[PDB]
Ligand binder design. Structure first.
Ligand SMILES: NC(=O)c1ccc[n+]([C@@H]2O[C@H](COP(=O)([O-])OP(=O)(O)OC[C@H]3O[C@@H](n4cnc5c(N)ncnc54)[C@H](O)[C@@H]3O)[C@@H](O)[C@H]2O)c1
Ligand SMILES: NC(=O)c1ccc[n+]([C@@H]2O[C@H](COP(=O)([O-])OP(=O)(O)OC[C@H]3O[C@@H](n4cnc5c(N)ncnc54)[C@H](O)[C@@H]3O)[C@@H](O)[C@H]2O)c1
Ligand SMILES: Cc1cc(C(N)=O)ccc1-n1c(CCC(=O)N2CCSC2=O)ccc1-c1ccc(-n2ccnc2)cc1
Ligand SMILES: Cc1cc(C(N)=O)ccc1-n1c(CCC(=O)N2CCSC2=O)ccc1-c1ccc(-n2ccnc2)cc1
Ligand SMILES: [Zn+2]
Ligand SMILES: [Zn+2]
Ligand SMILES: [Zn+2]
Ligand SMILES: [Zn+2]
Lengths: 373, 373
């Protein structure tokens, strides 16, 4: 119930490294929760915002949107979570009252997004003070800190037995891939699937396709060093566009005799998205867009590709309804139905957080986990 | 069983009028049917091919792909249809054996399309002789003639009580609109729908939406003279893009509080297709492409429109399985469930066939019916 002094990794300008500093964190107001972050993961959109390319970037700011922790304080009006619980913050809440929350077809809650995009709590202010300045929040969580304040609808409650040093990855990547495979596509047994890109999201998609029951899975990438891991996750074969003179969709059409049944696009390249649409089977093919492109880029095609059967669709947070569905995923990981331990490729300490970004800049890791205690 | 002399409307070069001539029609070979055309309808793709803009146009050729008639002769191996029957030719057959015919998700049979696109019968030759030249077939039917020869899988058998002078329209237009409404979209009661363009296909789509059970229907067009008929078919309101300074998708978003549930695009303009995608509701919107664009045009959008929920899909022949589904549509018209008599706007004789095209060039008619006897 009093201001907490803690250590954070603040960013001050676009394109500069993060600097470790001491910050003051205010007590939560009505309908808010204070969380001590235990572990976190460094995602790609964090580095994208840090670079400064985002037209909506606001500085100074504390990044991070993947982590798990333990509750200390709750505001006035909270009757759902008490101190000592193990929880996961979420950048897609679930109020349960709006028109988007009563529709089973969607999961895009639209209650606090106007303040979340500006970097402020729902009341209209920020809880982070540094040397007489106010530091904005990032994507509603801000987990690059030892303590953080979030809204009461952005918190999911998990089993206390879960290891918090690895279950944190179920915030952005593994959940998105698994949901893309088993929610937005809903693929029947015996299908043929193709995955573009073999990062964290691609490997999660491959895992979901193998779990659901597809017979043949094709992995596509321009870096050979990934192929090995793909074959461990369930991909039957892997190809490289640079080894063929013909365009990639023609290679896939020749290989699969007509085209694949499902194609997942997990990169963020508009040309790859067009190639992914044109490689689906005529009559019943489906293409799912998972990655996010830079602002100002357009994906083109001819309407003759849609008239003869094919479909575009897209997914955000794998289509899961976050608050009521993340606990089920943690339970699934308890039963060894899905793989979480095989995604983490590196471990760092808090002070070396900058090093994490450099690894992401080189393409040598899938996911890195930072221990914040 | 002998060559038949008949009257036809042959085209000799791109951009010239059709000329009425006398032709010889050969007896059918194995797995073929000879039909005496009674009535026909002039569609938009006929005039498109006649203009010469089609990169695949081949001349001389006999156009037409909508009509009903009576059988005279059948080839060797036909045990399904006998002479005197009332039938409808179809530009999408149904063999029932290929991989596309055993899949309930599609209706694009791929058995005789290679010869159909070239203008020849499956054996490899044409049955139309004129003054020592061979005349190719059009879209597998060629109904601008008093007698025509078609394959045995391109014929649907209907109730003999049907009036053949109006049931012919169930070949291309009304079927496509009705199927787009109730097959590819599958819209639930209480939905909001928007239709772009108010020709024959647009009015069929409106009829299907009203039958299925949507509550609110919005018609969009740039010609005011159409709006009246739309209000008779079930459209609740109609708008004109030229009356507003803002782009049309913003007008629709403001009007419907977020966007429509379903949007059908029935024109063939790539800019209208983009505007139709951007006017669907966030989270659960769907956009169905029905019209065909000119070769070399691309429809563009940003992937942020697909990531947040929306979908493109397309339809050819309304998704009906032609041979087994057209008789059901004729039965539906017998019970007054659907409207066929309200589409025909003009009637002509065979010799005035050219006049029909001129009407289509002015936008004063929905469908014109030519009586061929
Ligand atoms: N919509 C969502 O909810 C959501 C969630 C998480 C991530 N994402 C996005 O998914 C994308 C993947 O991110 P990530 O960190 O999981 O993996 P990553 O971006 O680090 O890996 C990208 C892979 O694509 C390959 N690549 C580059 N150009 C290629 C080309 N022409 N052809 C084939 N491969 C090419 C690269 O070699 C690489 O293996 C990102 O853009 C991310 O923003 C979206
Ligand atoms: N895929 C299929 O199976 C199939 C079947 C039949 C027809 N079609 C196609 O459907 C299209 C419609 O053909 P039709 O004969 O039924 O009607 P039509 O083409 O004669 O009517 C077109 C209407 O769109 C309007 N238009 C032009 N520009 C516009 C704009 N910017 N905004 C709004 N309206 C505009 C016109 O005023 C007109 O009312 C055609 O392109 C046809 O080729 C497709
Ligand atoms: C565009 C956007 C901005 C923010 C922000 N903070 O600026 C947050 C979310 C989104 N965004 C929306 C629009 C807003 C929206 O629909 N919703 C629903 C509940 S609240 C909310 O954000 C749809 C999809 C996304 C999205 C963006 C990035 C990632 N991504 C990439 C890598 N890692 C994460 C995943 C999804
Ligand atoms: C591109 C095409 C050419 C021909 C031809 N004769 O050149 C015939 C059909 C198509 N086409 C296909 C590819 C081929 C195909 O999938 N199939 C399935 C069974 S056979 C066959 O044609 C998919 C959709 C269409 C199509 C084209 C025009 C119209 N349209 C417009 C106005 N009025 C009619 C409707 C559909
Ligand atoms: Zn909500
Ligand atoms: Zn992320
Ligand atoms: Zn078939
Ligand atoms: Zn037609």
């Amino acid at each position: 119930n009093e201001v907490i002094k803690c250590k954070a990794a603040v960013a001050w300008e676009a394109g500069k490294p993060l600097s470790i500093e001491e910050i003051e964190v205010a007590p939560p107001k009505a309908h808010e929760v204070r969380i001590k972050i235990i572990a976190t993961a460094v995602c790609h959109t964090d580095a994208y915002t840090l670079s400064g390319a985002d037209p909506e970037g606001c500085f100074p700011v504390i990044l991070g949107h993947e982590g798990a922790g333990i509750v200390e304080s709750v505001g006035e009006g909270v009757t759902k979570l008490k101190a000592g619980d193990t929880v996961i913050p979420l950048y897609i809440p679930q109020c349960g009252e709006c028109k988007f929350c009563l529709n089973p077809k969607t999961n895009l809650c639209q209650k606090i997004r106007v303040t979340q995009g500006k970097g402020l709590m729902p009341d209209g202010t920020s809880r982070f003070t540094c040397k007489g300045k106010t530091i904005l929040h990032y994507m509603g969580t801000s987990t690059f800190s030892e303590y953080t304040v979030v809204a009461d609808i952005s918190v999911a409650k998990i089993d206390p037995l879960a290891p918090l040093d690895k279950v944190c990855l179920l915030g952005c990547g593994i959940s998105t891939g698994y949901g893309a495979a088993v929610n937005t596509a809903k693929l029947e047994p015996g299908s043929v699937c193709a995955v573009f890109g073999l990062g964290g999201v691609g490997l999660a998609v491959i895992m979901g396709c193998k779990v659901a029951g597809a017979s043949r899975i094709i992995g596509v990438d321009i870096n050979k060093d990934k192929f090995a891991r793909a074959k461990e996750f369930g991909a039957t074969e892997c190809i490289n566009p640079q080894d063929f003179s013909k365009p990639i969709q023609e290679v896939l059409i020749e290989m699969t005799d007509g085209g694949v049944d499902y194609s997942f696009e997990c990169i963020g390249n508009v040309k790859v998205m067009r190639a992914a649409l044109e490689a689906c089977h005529k009559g019943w093919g489906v293409s799912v867009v998972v990655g996010v492109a830079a602002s100002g880029e357009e994906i083109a095609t001819r309407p003759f590709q849609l008239v003869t059967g094919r479909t575009w669709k897209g997914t955000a947070f794998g289509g899961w309804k976050s608050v009521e569905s993340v606990p089920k995923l943690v339970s699934e990981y308890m039963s060894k139905k899905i793989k979480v331990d095989e995604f983490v490729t590196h471990n760092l300490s808090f002070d070396e957080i900058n090093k994490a970004f450099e690894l992401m800049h080189s393409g040598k890791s899938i996911r890195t986990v930072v221990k914040i205690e």
